Amino acid sequence: MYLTKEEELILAGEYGYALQKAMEILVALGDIYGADRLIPIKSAQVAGVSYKNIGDAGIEFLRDFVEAGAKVSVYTTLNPAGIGDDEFMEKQMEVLELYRKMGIEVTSTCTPYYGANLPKFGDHIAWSESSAVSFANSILGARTNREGGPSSLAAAIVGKTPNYGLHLDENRKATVIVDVKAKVKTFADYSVLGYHVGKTLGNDVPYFKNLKPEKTEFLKELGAAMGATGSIALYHVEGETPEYREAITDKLETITVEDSDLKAVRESFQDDWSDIDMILIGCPHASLPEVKEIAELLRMRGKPLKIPLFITASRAVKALADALGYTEIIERYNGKIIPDSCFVVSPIKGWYRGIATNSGKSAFYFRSFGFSVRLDDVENLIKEAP
Amino acid sequence: MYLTKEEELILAGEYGYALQKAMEILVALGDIYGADRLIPIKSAQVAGVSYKNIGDAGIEFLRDFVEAGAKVSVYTTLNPAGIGDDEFMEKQMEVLELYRKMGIEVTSTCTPYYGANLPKFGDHIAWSESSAVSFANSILGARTNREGGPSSLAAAIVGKTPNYGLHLDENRKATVIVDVKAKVKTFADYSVLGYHVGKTLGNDVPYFKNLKPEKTEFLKELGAAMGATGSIALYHVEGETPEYREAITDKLETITVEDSDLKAVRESFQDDWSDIDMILIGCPHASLPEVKEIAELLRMRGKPLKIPLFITASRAVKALADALGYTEIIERYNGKIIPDSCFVVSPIKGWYRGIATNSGKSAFYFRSFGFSVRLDDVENLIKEAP
Amino acid sequence: GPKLKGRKIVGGKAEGEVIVSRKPLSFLGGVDPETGIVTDAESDIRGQSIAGKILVFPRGKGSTVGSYVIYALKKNNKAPKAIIVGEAETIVATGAIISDIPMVDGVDVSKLKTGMKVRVDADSGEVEILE
Amino acid sequence: GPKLKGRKIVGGKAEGEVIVSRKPLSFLGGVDPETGIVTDAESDIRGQSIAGKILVFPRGKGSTVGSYVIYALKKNNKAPKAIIVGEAETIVATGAIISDIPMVDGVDVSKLKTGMKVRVDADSGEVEILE
Ligand SMILES: C[C@@](O)(CCOP(=O)(O)O)CC(=O)O
Ligand SMILES: C[C@@](O)(CCOP(=O)(O)O)CC(=O)O
Ligand code: F3S
Ligand code: F3S
Hints:
The complex is a heterotetramer, with two copies of chain A and two copies of chain C. Chain A is globular, with a radius of gyration of 21 Å. Chain A has 14 helices and 14 strands. Chain A has three domains: 163 residues, Aconitase, domain 3; 95 residues, Aconitase, Domain 2 (3-Layer(aba) Sandwich), CATH 3.40.1060.10; 115 residues, 2-Layer Sandwich (Aconitase, domain 3), CATH 3.30.499.10. In chain A, helix 1 packs across helix 2, helix 5 crosses helix 8 and helix 8 runs parallel beside helix 13. By secondary structure, chain A is α/β, with parallel strands linked by helices. Chain A starts with a helix and ends with a helix. Chain C is of the alpha/beta class. An eight-stranded mixed β-sheet of chain C has the order 1-8-7-3-4-5-6-2. In chain C, helix 3 links the parallel strand 5 and strand 6. The N and C termini of chain C lie close together (6 Å). Chains in contact: A-B, A-D, B-C. The complex binds (3R)-3-hydroxy-3-methyl-5-(phosphonooxy)pentanoic acid (2 copies) and FE3-S4 cluster (2 copies). Chains A, B: Its cofactor is [4Fe-4S] cluster. Chains A, B: This is Phosphomevalonate dehydratase large subunit. Chains A, B: Keywords: 4Fe-4S, Iron, Iron-sulfur, Isoprene biosynthesis, Lyase, Metal-binding. Chains A, B: Pfam families: AcnX.
């Protein structure tokens, strides 16, 4: 990878240890993957925030930067924190303060594009959080690799990322066609479609046919699920995503998704209500329409839930929910909007044994952690819950 | 225009006066413009909110709907309110309550796409507010006509809009090429570029060449200015907007914008500081990066302004500014973030004589209202102000 | 006299004196709804009243709230008797529709000049100059 | 023995016993950073330790925070001596880089089986099976 004279000086340490540590990560990556140069990025999104995920070793890694006075040189937003007991939260506050000290916007949400950091079509950025990578590449047509937490941080500090991978036109072409014969209409339908496709494909850029989502949040969930059971960073949907019309430049194979594929996932996430002690909506963090939907479903139920419902969402969405009166409605029925946080990355083993959700990403992770899981559309969960 | 049996019954009054009144507006429009049918819309954005703009006649028009129990049948957001004395605000609250009663999200912002209502590429919607029309068509590649306030409301109630105009592939093609030879780099550069182009073109879909904006907010302002001095609802920018690669399907003329064109606009908005008694940023409503920029400029100035600075912004952005600490910083230096409101649509004649701003849309309207106007980038305004 | 054939926007029939502008017009900012007086500081007919006249202009510009200004003009009985434009966009059409102001577009407005007497057959989109 | 030639991800040299999985792996969720024991309930090597071994798997999946799990494994001295993958994406590469764990990709991993002794010449991207 070519470096400018200024970048060579940064690598050499002429501008201090913090920039040099970040540059060393970016140079290693660009050299591995054959990047011609570093390109500037318009923003970063940094994952690796919950103390459960990064531990004391993660705190040490960040303190190494912070003690050298590290500061991000581009606009940078931040993924959500975990929730836990007093000892956990003390550690969790330590992490957030380390990120704050580097000049990052402590937004604590996996949906920064809801008011904090919205990439434009064609923008080169360096984002981790796999569902936000998928959203930015696929739904908005921005350009980012599936960054590791630390490589997004390194890019934020240098203000540049290596020019390889999804930054290049040729790596944004479809590699396979997915013909969705299955009936896919609801949020939870898209959850299990993404669950299936992520683990069926490899490192692919799928082109979806016969898929007409009513709501953007359906594609948000599709990308989130495929980035959990698989490694999908970019996909195309015919008529629905901005890069679809030049996505196919080769003769490609077609896989088809049938009802039987989706039934299999649904039937494996159907633990009994007697094993569920919370409902979780908002993985990735809920949009304001998602919050509105739940307020309406709770008022139609007309009696409070006897297990708690939690809606994880961005600060922006939480504030809109407060201002428009949805928060008060939802709390009337034993629901709560939890800003800034994520339950999947929280050590809640001893607090909850079973989670009902409409999110395929949450269902996948909670199952792999040993929880009971019921996956269903939120209207069914709210109607049937105790 | 073809109507389904259900739509014919609505037109006939079978489902009540509110739906029939809305349908009559949509049928008249579709018949004028040769629409084949009504198509469903995924959302609406409704302008005509400030009491200064709509008056008692506007209140009567809305009450006609509300007294018949009108309710929007799709997700609908709302443009900003005005600010004024006690009598004005009583009337202003009346308007907002009328919209609230129709089930509209009273978001009171011209930038609903910052967390409240983000259209997806290809989505058919019915939006008024000319800068948001421009944003949704041009930057996101959604599809909406330049709706009048009342036609967006009618569409929100029926949940459909007539299929003509910018909903059709053929009307999204470029009609003219704009070669920007002028140096255009800053926010205020884009303000005057849009001011010039809007009044130079007619009903056009311009394709911009040699224009590489560093920030999305630069294009937000470009579309806002062209929708003020002109009628531009959709434009393309080579490499930067999602529909650019198939925008040119004919041989088109090219106009060029030179430095002399932009100097002329700049030089006409340079009233003396002694005539200015407020600074206004956030037309259209400020993004969180815009708020961050101002906090940084005020801390570098290091002393308070002696005239007030106002930042109009969405509730979402205001809440992020509160949560991230920018509101406190800005208030230290005689700045304020004003949510839910717009100064251009406020009766502030007797409160302020002159407005300094970086917005070409604000500069145009305040000039036409008789105010003194200084147009400049916000870094220069903050450095030079008393 | 000579007939100019265009497109019906809002039906009705009217006859009166023409007032012509050659610049695009935004009713929000360009016309005072209380008086019917043009208030655009750069209009070629600034200061003149449109109330009760036949208003000619090439096309709209500016605010999507222009439809509400047209409606307020009509409710204050200060609106033109009819409107003739070169091209009528959704905002202007919507104002005429909710205000029941006869309106046509697609007319070669360069052939109309201030002070002419005209019949507008808005139902058929036709303008007739009266000699 | 036979040599498999691939691509350097992180340099270094190592020799040890191979533990092979044929399923994509997410370190966040798939490996306990405290122990080095695979915790994926659907891994074909669930319950086995990767610490001090030569880990073979086809490609990563899942969390972008996997890089931090790899780093925590290394700091707990429970990380493999080296890692061989079919294709190494940014997340996995980044974990190896900050952890200084020798790593290669582009290897035909179907030719590796559990219990083999191997030399990994990560500087040159080469894996040698020891007979
Ligand atoms: C699994 C994942 O959602 C974990 C996020 O953890 P954190 O909030 O960034 O600490 C990250 C991803 O999917 O890339
Ligand atoms: C001029 C304009 O910004 C006025 C908006 O007024 P209101 O807040 O929707 O009442 C509307 C537009 O530009 O379309
Ligand atoms: S970070 Fe967000 S995408 Fe899901 S696993 Fe947590 S709510
Ligand atoms: S509505 Fe918004 S676009 Fe400007 S004129 Fe008012 S701040």
